[PDB]
Assembly symmetry: C4
Homo-oligomer: 259 residues x 4
C-alpha cells in the first residue's frame, strides 16, 4: 500500500504536508528552468576584452549547465517516482502528462550523448526548442490549463475543420494573389507558397506589410481575402468558447457539489 500512498500523494497534493512541499518544489523548479532557458539567450553586454556580445548561456555556460542538470535530475527523479509508484503503469505511461514529462526530460540526455559534436547546429537547436516543453509541466499545477487542454480535446473536430477550411482558403487566395501579383516589379509574390505568407497574414488581420499588393486586382483580392478570413476564422471560435465555458462551469458545479 506504500505505492498507492505515494500515488495518492502525487495525484492529490493537498493531503499531506510532504506531498504539498514536493508539489511546490516541483513547481518552483519548473519555473526556474523555464526562466533560465529564456534568460540564457540574453546578451551579457561586452566582456573585458570581448569583440562582440555573448549570451548569458555562453558567458556562463558552466553555471547554466549546472542549473539545467539540477532541474533535470529533479524532473527525472519525480518522473521515476511517479512511474514505479503508480497502480497501473501502462495507464500512467500512456497518460498525457507522462509524455509531457518524458519530452521535457529526454532532450537533456540526448544532448549528453551528443556531447562529441555540440558546435554543430541542427539537432542542437531542435533540443533547445524542445526544452520549452517543460512549461507544459505547469499543467499539473494549473487547473485552468487542464481546462484548456480538455476543451482543446473536446473541439478536435471543430479545430480540424478550421484547419481544413483555412488550408483551402490559403490555397485559393495564394493562387489568386500570386497570379495577380507575379508581374509586379520586385514582386514578393514569387510563387504560390510565397503567397501563403501574405494570405495567412491577411486573413488573420495581422497586416505586417512586408508583402502588400501593388496591383488593382491584388488590392481587390486582398480585400476579399481579409473579409473571408475573418468569417472563416470566426466559425469555430464560438463553439470553442462555448466548450471552454461549459467545462469551466461544469467543474465549478462539481466543486460546489462536493464542497
Amino acid at each position: 500500500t506504500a505505492r498507492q500512498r505515494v500515488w495518492r500523494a502525487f495525484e492529490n497534493p493537498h493531503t499531506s504536508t510532504m506531498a504539498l512541499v514536493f508539489y511546490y518544489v516541483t513547481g518552483f523548479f519548473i519555473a526556474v528552468s523555464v526562466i533560465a532557458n529564456v534568460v540564457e539567450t540574453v546578451p551579457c553586454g561586452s566582456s573585458p576584452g570581448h569583440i562582440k556580445e555573448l549570451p548569458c548561456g555562453e558567458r556562463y555556460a558552466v553555471a547554466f549547465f549546472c542549473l539545467d542538470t539540477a532541474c533535470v535530475m529533479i524532473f527525472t527523479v519525480e518522473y521515476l517516482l511517479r512511474l514505479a509508484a503508480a497502480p497501473s503503469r501502462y495507464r500512467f505511461v500512456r497518460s498525457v502528462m507522462s509524455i509531457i514529462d518524458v519530452v521535457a526530460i529526454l532532450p537533456y540526455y540526448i544532448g549528453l550523448v551528443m556531447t562529441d559534436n555540440e558546435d554543430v547546429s541542427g539537432a542542437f537547436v531542435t533540443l533547445r526548442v524542445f526544452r520549452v516543453f517543460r512549461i507544459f509541466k505547469f499543467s499539473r499545477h494549473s487547473q485552468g490549463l487542464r481546462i484548456l487542454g480538455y476543451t482543446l480535446k473536446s473541439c478536435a473536430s471543430e479545430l480540424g475543420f478550421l484547419l481544413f477550411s483555412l488550408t483551402m482558403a490559403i490555397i485559393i487566395f495564394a493562387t489568386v494573389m500570386f497570379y495577380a501579383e507575379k508581374g509586379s516589379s520586385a514582386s514578393k509574390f514569387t510563387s504560390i507558397p510565397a503567397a501563403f505568407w501574405y494570405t495567412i497574414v491577411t486573413m488573420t488581420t495581422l497586416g505586417y506589410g512586408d508583402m502588400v499588393p501593388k496591383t488593382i486586382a491584388g488590392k481587390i483580392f486582398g480585400s476579399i481575402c481579409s473579409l473571408s478570413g475573418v468569417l472563416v476564422i470566426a466559425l469555430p471560435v464560438p463553439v470553442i468558447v462555448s466548450n471552454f465555458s461549459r467545462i469551466y462551469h461544469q467543474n465549478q458545479r462539481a466543486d460546489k457539489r462536493r464542497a
Copy 2:
C-alpha cells in the same frame, strides 16, 4: 436500373466497395492536381547553365502537363459518368457541383484549343487561376464544406447587406480621407479609388502601413474609420455564426435520429 445503381453509388459512397474506391481515387486525384498546381510555381533553383531560376512547371513542363492531363481525364470521365447515369439530367446539370466540375474541367480544354498562342499572358493567367476551382471538388468529400456552403446560401441576405454597408462606408471614408490627405507631400491618396485601399485595410484592422495618414484630420478620420469598420463588420457575423452552428447541429440531430 443500371443508371440508378450508378447514381446511388456516386451519391452514396459507403454502399459498395467499388463506389468507395472510386470516391477515394477521385479525392486523391483532386489532392494531387491541387498540389501540383501549387508546386509548379516554385523555382527549381538554378539549372546547369541557366541564367535565372525557372519554376517547377517550366523546367519540367512535360511532366506537369502529363500529370494535369491525367487528372483532367479522370475528372471528365467521372463527370460524364455522373451525367449519363443520373435519373434527372437537368437537375444534375443545374446542380451546383456540376457547375463546379465543369469549371474545373473546361480551362484545360480551352487551353488545348488555344495552343497556337500560349506565350501570351492574359487568358493564360485566367485559365491558370481557374484551375484552382478543382479544390471546390473536395466539397463532395467534406461534410463541413457542404455545411459552409449551406450557411453561405442561408445568409445571402445578410451577406448582401454587409456588402452594401461596406460599400457605403468605403465610399464615405475614402472621400473623407482623400480630401483630407490629397495635399500631403508624396501622398498615396491620389484619388478616392486609391483611398478605397486605405479604407478597406483600415476597417478590417489589417494595418499594412503602405498607406498611412500624415495629417491631423487624416489621423482623426482614420481612427473613426477603424472603429466604424469594426462595428459594421461585426453586424452580420453573429447571424452567420448562428446559422452555421444551427446547420451543423441540425445535421448532428439528423445523424443521431437515423443512427
Copy 3:
C-alpha cells in the same frame, strides 16, 4: 387630398406605378451622383501636350458640372415636392431624412454663391466632402440602412460610454507611451497628442507600424495597450449587435404579421 395622395406616394413607393418610377429614378440619380463624385478624382492619364496628369473632374469640368447640376435639380425638386406636399411640414422638416436631403443639396448652391473665389481651397474641399452625404439618401431606399440607423439611435448610451472609455484609455496610454518613448532617437512620440495616434492604432489592433515603440517600457505598455483596447472595444459591441438583431427580427415578425 392631393397633398396627402402625394405624401402616400412618396412615403410608400409600391402603391402606384408613378410613385415607383419616381422612387427608382431618384435612386438611380443618387447612384449616378455618388459614382460621378468618386470618379472625378481619378486622373485621366496624360492629355496631348499636358505636363502632368489631370483628374476626370478637371479635364472635363463642364461635363461633370452638368451632371452634378442635373442631379442637384432632381434632388431639390424631389425635396420641394416632399416639403410642400406633406401633412405636417414641421414634422417633415425636423425629420432626419429632411436634414439629410438639405445637407446633400445645399453644398451645391453654396458653391454657386462662392463662384467668385473657387481656386482657393478650404471651404471648397469642405463642400466637396459634404457632397458625399448624398449616399445617405440611399437610406430611403435600403431597409437595412434604416435598421442600422435605428440601432445606432437605440445604442446611443452604449456608444457614448464607449467613446468615454476610449477617450480615457487613449489619454492614459498616450501619456504613458509619450513619457516612456520621448527619449528615443528620432522619436515619433513628440507629444501626448502625437501618441494619441499610436494609442488608437494599437488599441484597435491595426498596427500600421508608422509609430512603434523602441524602448522596453514602450514595448510593455504597448502590449498592455493592445490587450486593454481589445477588452474596452469589445464591451459595447455585443449590446450593439443584440440591438441590431433585435430590430431586424422585430421587423421580420412585423412583416410576417401583416403579410
Copy 4:
C-alpha cells in the same frame, strides 16, 4: 450630525445644490488638470530667437505650475473634507477612491520636496506619468466607469488565467521564433525576450511589421502564433462581457425598482 450631513452630500450629489455645485466644480477641475497635463507636452512652434521648439509646459512653465497647483489644492481640500467628515475613516481610507485620490495628489507634493533637483529625469518622468491617475477621479462622476471597475474586480480570476495563458504562449512562441530566426541576416530576434515583442504583437493581430519572420519555419510558427493568440485571447472575453452586461443590467433593474 454635521459630519454625516457632509458625508451624505459628498456620497450623493443630487441632494442639495451646494453638493451639486461642489460635485460639478470638482469634475470641471479634474477635466482641466487632465487637459493641461496633456497640452503642456505640445510644442509652441518657435519662439522669437529660439533655436528649437519648446513645449507648452516649458515656454509657459509658471502658468502651468499655477494651474496645476490650483487643481491640486482643490483636490486636496476635497480629499481632506472627505476624510475628516466621514463616519468610518478606516473604511474611507481603505476605499479604492481614497487611494485614487492620494495617488492623484501626492506626486505634486513629492515634486515640491524634490525641487532641489528638477532637471534630472527618472523620478521626474515617473511623477509626470503618475499625474494621469487624476483621470481615474472621473470614476466618481461616471457610472459606467464604476461598472467597468466592478466587472474588472468580478473577473479577477478570468483575467489572471488570461495573463497566465498569455505568458505561457508568449514564452513558447518566443522560444520557437527566436531559435527559428536567430540565424537570419540582421535579425531582430536577438534573444527570446526580444521575440516577446514579436509574439505579443502577433497574437493580438497587430502586425506592426517592425519584426517579421524571414525564414520558412519563422513563417509557419508566426502563422500558428497568430491563430493560437486569437483563440487564447478569445477565451475570457465572453465571460468578461457577460459580467459587464450583467452588472449594467442589474443596475438598470435596481434603478427601475427604486424608481
